[PDB]
């Protein structure tokens, strides 16, 4: 009936859509982290190989030597970036798999009350246009009460969603800002070293 539910289902939609989007970013993020993890372990092993080859071969020692520093250094920094990426992961994860899941816990209950609101809306209409007898006048009144009961359930939880989306969107933007920032800064800091 109302304009609110039409504007709400619209926003519900948008929340669900952008969730899967962040789960992709999260997915890809953890892929990259594992990638980086592999890289450093190799870099460490190659540093140590270059280092050993430097000590055993006087004729070529400088060439392996400074190649061994560079690999070793790159991991030391990689091992730092790896941390930052991980910290990005869990923060986003909190937003995605916890913070918004809290809103979806409520979104479902909102819909549970809605479906209930309509099944009791039907009963009222099926009876107000049906036959009459002892067991019609008495029946419409106990339909009204239960219709109005679930109305209240529906109205309150509709109100409650609007609140949780309003407070999500704000917090979502905060976390996102701070993470997309500490993400970028971590990448550049890595090259800076």
């Amino acid at each position: 009936s109302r304009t609110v539910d039409l504007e709400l289902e619209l926003q519900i939609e948008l929340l669900r859509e952008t969730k899967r989007k962040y789960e992709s970013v999260l997915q890809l993020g953890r892929a990259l982290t594992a990638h980086l993890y592999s890289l450093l372990q190799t870099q460490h092993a190659l540093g140590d190989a270059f280092a050993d080859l430097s000590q055993k071969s006087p004729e070529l020692q400088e060439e392996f030597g400074y190649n061994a520093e560079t690999q070793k250094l790159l991991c030391k920094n990689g091992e730092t970036l790896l941390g930052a990426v991980n910290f990005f992961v869990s923060s986003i994860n909190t937003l995605v798999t916890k913070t918004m899941e809290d809103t979806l816990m409520t979104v479902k209950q909102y819909e549970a009350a809605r479906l209930e609101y309509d099944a009791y809306r039907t009963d009222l209409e099926e009876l107000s246009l049906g036959p009459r007898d002892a067991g019609t006048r008495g029946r419409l009144e106990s339909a009204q009460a239960t219709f109005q009961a679930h109305r209240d359930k529906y109205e309150k939880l509709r109100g409650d969603v609007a609140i949780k989306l309003k407070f999500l969107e704000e917090n979502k933007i905060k976390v996102m800002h701070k993470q997309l920032l500490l993400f970028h800064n971590a990448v550049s800091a890595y090259f800076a070293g």
Binding site: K98, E170, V175
Partner: protein, 165 residues
Amino acid sequence: TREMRILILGLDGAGKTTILYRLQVGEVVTTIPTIGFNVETVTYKNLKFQVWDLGGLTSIRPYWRCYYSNTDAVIYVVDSCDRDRIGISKSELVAMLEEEELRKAILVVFANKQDMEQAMTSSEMANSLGLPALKDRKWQIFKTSATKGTGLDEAMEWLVETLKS
């Protein structure tokens, strides 16, 4: 061993957010008023915590109850150097504990800003809020300062201790 849900509650400017990130990263951070909530996963004593930090401004106090579901403990922060607003702090505390979704919730009260000179004694706040007159509720109050770091480990160890039992 399961992940626990914690809500940081209390009036504006009590130090709720400072506490949050001091529990997360052990540092003092620059903070603004929380227009809504803050949320971080925080490991302490190998126990995972889903911590929620709601803002204390009148605007968003009646909406606290929206997030009361599945709460294991309530950390209630009260400014110790805010004697002109403790009456407000009490009625909102009481109005909360009358809720039914906080049936299992353990009350922990943070007497914050103890590093301050004119800071209240742990005694006078505890009486003011009405901690001794509580029926069937595990409560404990601690002297804390998020700026210094004092009384956090103690508070959190008690908090963990209670949840394990």
